[PDB]
Amino acid sequence: GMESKYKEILLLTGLDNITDEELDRFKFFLSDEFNIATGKLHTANRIQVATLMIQNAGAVSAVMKTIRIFQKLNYMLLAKRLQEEKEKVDKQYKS
Amino acid sequence: GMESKYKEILLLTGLDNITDEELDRFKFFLSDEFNIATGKLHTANRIQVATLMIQNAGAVSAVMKTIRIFQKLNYMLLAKRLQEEKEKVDKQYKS
Amino acid sequence: GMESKYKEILLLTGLDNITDEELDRFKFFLSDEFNIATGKLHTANRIQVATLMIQNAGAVSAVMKTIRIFQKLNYMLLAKRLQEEKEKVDKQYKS
Amino acid sequence: GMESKYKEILLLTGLDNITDEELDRFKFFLSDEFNIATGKLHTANRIQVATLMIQNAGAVSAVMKTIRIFQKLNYMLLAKRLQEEKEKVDKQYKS
Amino acid sequence: GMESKYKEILLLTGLDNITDEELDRFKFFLSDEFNIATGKLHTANRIQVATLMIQNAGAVSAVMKTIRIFQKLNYMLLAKRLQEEKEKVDKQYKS
Amino acid sequence: GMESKYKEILLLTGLDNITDEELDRFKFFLSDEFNIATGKLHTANRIQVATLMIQNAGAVSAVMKTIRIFQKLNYMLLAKRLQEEKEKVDKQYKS
Amino acid sequence: GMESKYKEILLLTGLDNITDEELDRFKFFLSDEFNIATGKLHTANRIQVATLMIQNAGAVSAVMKTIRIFQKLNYMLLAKRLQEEKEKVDKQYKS
Amino acid sequence: GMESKYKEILLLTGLDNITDEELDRFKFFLSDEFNIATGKLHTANRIQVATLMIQNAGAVSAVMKTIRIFQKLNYMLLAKRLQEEKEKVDKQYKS
Amino acid sequence: GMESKYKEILLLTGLDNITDEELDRFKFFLSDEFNIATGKLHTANRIQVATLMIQNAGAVSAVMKTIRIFQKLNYMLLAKRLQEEKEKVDKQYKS
Amino acid sequence: GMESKYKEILLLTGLDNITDEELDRFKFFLSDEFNIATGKLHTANRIQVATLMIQNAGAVSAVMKTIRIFQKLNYMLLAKRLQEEKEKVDKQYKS
Amino acid sequence: GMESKYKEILLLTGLDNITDEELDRFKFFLSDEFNIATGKLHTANRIQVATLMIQNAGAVSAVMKTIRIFQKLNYMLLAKRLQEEKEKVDKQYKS
Amino acid sequence: GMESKYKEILLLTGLDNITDEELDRFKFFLSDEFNIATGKLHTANRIQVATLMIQNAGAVSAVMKTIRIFQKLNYMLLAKRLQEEKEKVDKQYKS
Amino acid sequence: GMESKYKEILLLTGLDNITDEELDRFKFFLSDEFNIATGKLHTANRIQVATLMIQNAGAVSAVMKTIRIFQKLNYMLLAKRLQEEKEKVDKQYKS
Amino acid sequence: GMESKYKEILLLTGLDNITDEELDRFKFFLSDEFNIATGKLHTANRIQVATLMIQNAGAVSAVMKTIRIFQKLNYMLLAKRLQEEKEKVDKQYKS
Amino acid sequence: GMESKYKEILLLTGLDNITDEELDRFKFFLSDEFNIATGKLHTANRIQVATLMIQNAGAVSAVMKTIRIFQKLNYMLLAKRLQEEKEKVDKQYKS
Amino acid sequence: GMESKYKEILLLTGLDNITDEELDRFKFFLSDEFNIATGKLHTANRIQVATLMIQNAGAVSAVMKTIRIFQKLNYMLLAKRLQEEKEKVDKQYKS
Amino acid sequence: GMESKYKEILLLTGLDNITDEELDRFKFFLSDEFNIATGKLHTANRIQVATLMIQNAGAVSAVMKTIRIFQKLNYMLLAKRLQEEKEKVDKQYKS
Amino acid sequence: GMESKYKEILLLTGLDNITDEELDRFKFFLSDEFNIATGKLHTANRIQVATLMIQNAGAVSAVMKTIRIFQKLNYMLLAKRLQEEKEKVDKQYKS
Amino acid sequence: GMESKYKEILLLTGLDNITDEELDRFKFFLSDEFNIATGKLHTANRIQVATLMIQNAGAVSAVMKTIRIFQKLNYMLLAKRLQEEKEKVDKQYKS
Amino acid sequence: GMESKYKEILLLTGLDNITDEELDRFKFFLSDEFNIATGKLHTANRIQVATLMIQNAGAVSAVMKTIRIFQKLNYMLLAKRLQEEKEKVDKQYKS
Amino acid sequence: GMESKYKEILLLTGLDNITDEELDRFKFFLSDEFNIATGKLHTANRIQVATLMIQNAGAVSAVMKTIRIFQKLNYMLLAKRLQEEKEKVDKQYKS
């Protein structure tokens, strides 16, 4: 169930709140944290980006490295919100 | 039929009468009343904004929260007009 | 033959004269007059919109409800032109 | 007959009213409610999605979990409409 | 001879005018009107679908239930055309 | 007579409702429940598959293990339908 | 002479109109109505099947049980046609 | 010799120019013009179809009813070509 | 000499032009026109079939009942050819 | 040879010079001039459209009705070019 | 009389229900249970096989070893049926 | 070749020399000289405007009516230049 | 020896190079050139076809009429090759 | 050997370098140069197309008419390449 | 029983969760781990791929090398899931 | 008795588990291990193949060379299963 | 090799250096130099434009007419650069 | 033994690694290297193709001409692999 | 003794290695080398064929003409093997 | 093993990192380095492109010419990365 | 890791701090330092500009030539900041 909650955190809170140019910055910094080939990243939307991130690193490190890339882009609000949702889920299932 | 009348109130009277900068203020205050992800709000036009509002909260609370956000922006004329159209429709179908 | 004339009225006079944003308003008000599922309306062009309207309500009520939706959008010129073409065809075949 | 009515609710009201990107979000959240292998979900259309949902969980829990996934995606209008149609059918055959 | 005319109505007017996705919707709603096993419906074309419908319910109830399923799919134009052809044949041989 | 009813359940309800790829999955899981040599399973159709299953395990355990393999393939609808038909026949002749 | 007419009904109308897979379904359901050993049914053609049916139950119960097995296979058209030919012969010689 | 020329017209001009799906439509409309049992039509190729048509109605009415069925399928080009070849042969031997 | 000509008509034109399955249909319908015991018909070839037909009914009624059985099997071409050869011989010796 | 020249006029000059949306308008107006079932028109390309037009009305009336439909779509340049090529071929072979 | 009943069990229930390839498997496993020379088994039919089995081991051990060879071939249905008939005869005459 | 020269006159001299607001005036006066649907004019650039003008009236009347619309907008310099280029081409090819 | 060379031409070059469907076309056109009864042609292979052709018309007219039937089937390559081999043998023994 | 070189020219240089839509144009223009029945052309691939062309006109006129059809489709590069390879082979064996 | 559990792991968890393009990558990397001839891999589906893998290396090394190839394709989620299911089965039967 | 057990291993485990194409590969590699004339191998089934192998090399070397040929065909699963059954029988009778 | 160098000149130097609106001007002037149907030009990118130009006129006249069209559009810099690269290649291979 | 090794090279390495369309190209080029009649090549599989090649030219020239035909089809990898296996066998037995 | 060795060469190596269709080709070419009446060849098996060949020409010319007929059928492998065995026997007894 | 490493370099590092338009440029420059027919390149994806490159030139020259084509497209980063991976593998296995 | 740090320097410090007109000056001076085709530069944003710079020259020379172009534009502050970040990274990883 923690997989599903990290899917909702990653897609619904994280990727849905960034704009299109911010999505292009995010795809510009995916290849330095994930070892994902950029040739399918180049035209992906938010759902395919979440599918490549969860598929290529797991949901836990997908959300954690999403926080890391959002801190690379100086998006302190969204990184703070993903840490709040992530700690609510870690409180939810790790306790 | 009340759904269609609230669609005409929301799009035709409400959103079509605000300008582009006023639309950007409106999108700036959508996220505090609707729980809509802003990443698709950022480049939406009036029709897509009405589609996200009606889709994400229903037409009744969409128009009512439109009145509320227009009162947050001190647009007393448009909020008064949406209350007039809304009470004409509530008189039309609720009686 | 009246089917073909109402096809020419609907596509050639009606839908071809509205712009793209006006087409999006038109698709925003199709679901309140036609019981058409919007999931295929969302990316349709004018030909597919005319195909769904004629397919889902017939050409006669398709053109008549096109006049009705154009009067919902306050497009009095195009609604007047569709009534002129529609009465020329009704004069043509109904007499 | 309740199977057929839940088929009409699921395909006609539920899946036909969501767009293509919303369908991709829906497929992104099918695997957390259904235990359906995603490799055939990835290129399915609405009919094949309804066939996998009804085939893999039954029509009743298919429509009920459709309401649940639509509430995960914050689609309160479509979830409300599926609850209205579902309660009309449960009133129709359960009474 | 009425069998042959209902074959021409069913295949030529009815099934040949629906598209491929509409054929998949039609096959999705065959099992609720015909008691036909879907395992051979899944890859059938229009001719094999007409053969299973006429074979499994007769041509008269095949065309009549084709009108019924087309009214389930909100295809009012094709259902109206099948009622026009069906009443021309019933006028042709029943009178 | 119970042999004939389980033949109608197995062939008519069970095997006729699965598609061709689902039949290939079913043949892929026959060898783990039946001790049937796969060399004649590889090109069999539904009738020859039913003949090898009834011939190699009897009709009762053929239908019961059909329910078991359909539950291995997560086909809850068809397994539920075979349990409904099987309990109608067990009610029919065992009572 | 009624024997010859039931031979023409059974072979010419009944068995010649079913296909090869339908013939295999028919042979799959012969053993539940006729007490015929299946070891010679397995490779028979339509003429040998008619010879075993007429030889093992008579032509009258052969055609009547052919109608019964065709109603087991949901072949309502062919069962209706065999009842029409059978009642034309029973009208022909029984009156 | 007219038999051989109508064989060349039927097989070489008529049946060889229709595709496979058009052949299945043709077999779907053979049973309404020829009184041929469909159970051997179902898997026949063009040569066996020509053999059943010439065998069951003669070559002259075989080609003439081929023109009639091609006009049922709205194949005006092939029906026109078969009338041209048929009138060249009737000019060839009838004069 | 008319006996020899009807032998050539029966064996050379009639029985040699039907195939093996058509020969089995012919043997299936010999017992209704000839009062021939089928136990020697079951493995006969065309020459032994002609010997039993000419031996058991004479050559004239053998060829005439061959035309009758070929019209029972809807073989209008071969029945027409046997009537043409039979009328050439009846013209040859009866005039 | 005039058939081949009208094929080159129809495919090479006529259909190859219209764009994809213009092809969809053309398919939208094929059903009013040709009695072609639209269910195969819906996904056809230019070659299959030319095959259905030449197959269903002949090449001469195919090109002439192509000029007529291009004049329905106000494509005066392409209709003028098809009349120029058509009159060059009619000058070529009719004189 | 028990000899005759075991003859009816062996030939009528046992050997008549196996197919030709199953008969060849049965002959392939006769030489390991009966000490029968295979040179006359190689072209025998079911009657000659039953004659060699009853002649070479008696009817009782013929039927019992038939059950044993059918259990070698995993034919649990036919072995179960031969045990049912064998126990009906042993109940019939041994009690 | 005169078609190409009028294309160079229309696009290169005529439409490329007017500004964006002048292009919007030009599109505002296209519908009174060309019978072009304005819904695609509304967002066209100079190349698409030239394509709709040449496509919908030919190059000769396209350039001549371009001169006429430029004289409606009081653009005497550009209308004079298009008459100079047009008379250089008419001198070039008409003499 | 010319008989043997025409046997090698007919079987080895002619009949061995045509496929199975082409062999069925060839058998479909044997009866118009050879007066061979088709009832043994229907299941013959290439060797039996060559035996009936050489037996029923001689090897010389067998190969020459093979060229003629191959020219009826528009097989210009194989007819050209049989004319080349036939003229090599006629050069070989006729000179 | 010239046959083999023209096979390599036709298949390897000619047909392998055209795409799928270009192959459909090529099949659309085969019937005007070859007298090949289109019913087997409709689903052929490049190898079967080369087999029908070489089989129905020889390799020399097959390649030469391939150049002619490629010049009908304005494929000057591939027609030039086939003329270069064809003249290299004609230089190779004709000199 | 461990064979059956590794079949369910390989087909149900492993191959059913990868998409079609991912299946083509998987087939692209089968030949480097299995010594399987690719000529039958090229058009196989998931069931035939699982049959060739289990047939050509056993189920244990089939699943283990499936994990290895999924780690070659950087599919860490599916490789982790196959290691979880594989260790649940090794815990299930190895302990 | 070891002869009978190796017969059950060879036919039941070995040859019955390979498919038809795998049987043709097996027959393709029989002649390199057995000195069996292939002219009777070419149309044999599994029982006749087992009869020629046991007849021509004995059951022990028949099963052992079956393992060897299955290892030539890279069928490691079936070769492993035949070694398991062979070592169970060698444990059974050699100890 | 000169073909490859003119491909690099045309795509890399010529078409890659023009913008999107300049590409639309270029496509607007392709039809006056190439006899290319514009219906596939309308949505092509630079690679498909280069493929249609090289395919429809050869690489040499493709680059030379590219220089000519660039001089029609007054692009003296790019036409000068294509003449410089073209003369470097003509110096490279023509000397 | 060299015959067996060249059989394993030809079937296992050579023909099993080419796909089905590549097999059809291979059969298209067999007739230019082997003097094999194509009428049995047309429906052969890889085993029958290897049987005709080894039967009609020997295994040594079969593998060597397989390398030659694979170099005609530009399959440098498979031709290189067959030369590697062929030189391993020639090293194995020729030294 | 040379008679016996040529019997073993002819029957065991030569005739036993050809298939049934190849035996029919061989019988088709026996009459051109042996002056054997074909009426007993038509149903002979390999042993009776060897008996007629050795009886009608001696064993030496029987084997030598067997090589000659196998070279007529392009069976270079079997002709080479018969020459190898024949030269081993001629080395065995002639030296 | 070097073949597998160059497969991983070519597909995983090289082709997966280029986008779709870059893939179309790559396919535009494949025909100048590989002698691959472009008709199957035109719709290939990255896996089929890698299969044609490795199949048509080997993996070593496939990767090396991939570096060469990437240097033709000025992709210095990807060419540098393929040289780094290629030298890591050449260090891995060549040392 | 130095690649990622130079990506953050180039995009985050360098390109994000210049305005839109300064970005147009930067694109105006990219073609003199990078050999990048300007046709895709013309509408690129900062992310696509960074992708073309890093893709076309590497990250190190991308940042260094960014400093060089910023010194061409007299942007001494941003060039100084990029030298400070670049020397912090060169201190970070080069020491």
Numbering used by the authors:
A (entry chain K), B (entry chain R), C (entry chain L), D (entry chain E), E (entry chain B), F (entry chain G), ...: 1 to 95
The authors write:
AIM2 (absent in melanoma 2) is a bipartite protein composed of the N-terminal PYD followed by the dsDNA-binding HIN domain (hematopoietic interferon-inducible nuclear antigen). PYDs are six-helix bundles that belong to the death-domain (DD) superfamily and can assemble into helical filaments. The upstream PYD filaments then nucleate the filamentation of the PYD of central adaptor ASC (ASCPYD), leading to the oligomerization of the CARD of ASC (ASCCARD) to recruit and trigger the polymerization (activation) of procaspase-1 (ASC: apoptosis-associated speck-forming protein containing caspase-recruiting domain (CARD); CARDs are also six-helix bundles that belong to the DD family). AIM2 is essential for the host defense against numerous pathogenic viruses and bacteria.
